[PDB]
Amino acid sequence: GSHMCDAFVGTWKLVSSENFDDYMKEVGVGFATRKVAGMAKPNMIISVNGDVITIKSESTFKNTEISFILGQEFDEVTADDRKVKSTITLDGGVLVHVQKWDGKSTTIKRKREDDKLVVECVMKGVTSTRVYERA
Ligand SMILES: O=C(O)CCn1c(-c2ccccc2)c(-c2ccccc2)c2cc(C3CC3)ccc21
C-alpha cells in the first residue's frame, strides 16, 4: 500500500529557477553545457513500484532516468555527463540525494511545500532553488 513518499509521485513542470548558473559553475559544468542546460525547462516524473523509486527528467536538452532503493548506493550518469556514486535517503519527509565523484560531493534535496515540489541543489556554499508545480 501507500507510503509517505507517494506525495512526490506524479508529473511535475519547472516553473522557477534561481542561481542555477552559479550552482553549475561550482559543480564544474563548462560554458556551453551551462547555457543549454540552464535554458531547459524539464518536466520531472516520479514513480514508485515496491521498494524501487524512479525519477525521470524529460526536456529539449537531455532526458535522464534513475531507479533506486532508499539507502542503497548506485551508479548515475548526470545530465552534464558526470559519472557519480549516488545514494538517496529520506530524512523526515525530505528526499536527500548525495552524488560523489572525483573527491567532490553535491546534495540535492527535494521537499513538498504547498502545491510545489521545491528542489534545493547545494555545492559547497552555493545553493540553487528549482521550483516545480504539477503538470
Ligand atoms: O531539479 C533539478 O533541476 C535538479 C536535478 N537535476 C535535473 C533534473 C533531474 C530530474 C528531473 C528534472 C530535472 C537536471 C536536468 C535534467 C534535464 C534537463 C536539464 C536539467 C539537472 C542538471 C544539473 C546540471 C548538472 C548540473 C544538475 C541537477 C539537475
Curated annotation (Swiss-Prot):
Coiled-coil intervals, chain numbering: none
Residues noted as binding a fatty acid in the record, renumbered to the chain: 130-132
Pfam families cross-referenced by the UniProt entry: Lipocalin (PF00061)
Keyword Acetylation attributed: yes
Gene Ontology terms: cellular component: cytoplasm; cytosol; extracellular exosome; lipid droplet; nucleus
SUPFAM superfamilies: Lipocalins
Family according to the record: Belongs to the calycin superfamily. Fatty-acid binding protein (FABP) family.
Name this polypeptide is given: Fatty acid-binding protein, adipocyte
Phylogenetic lineage: Eukaryota, Metazoa, Chordata, Craniata, Vertebrata
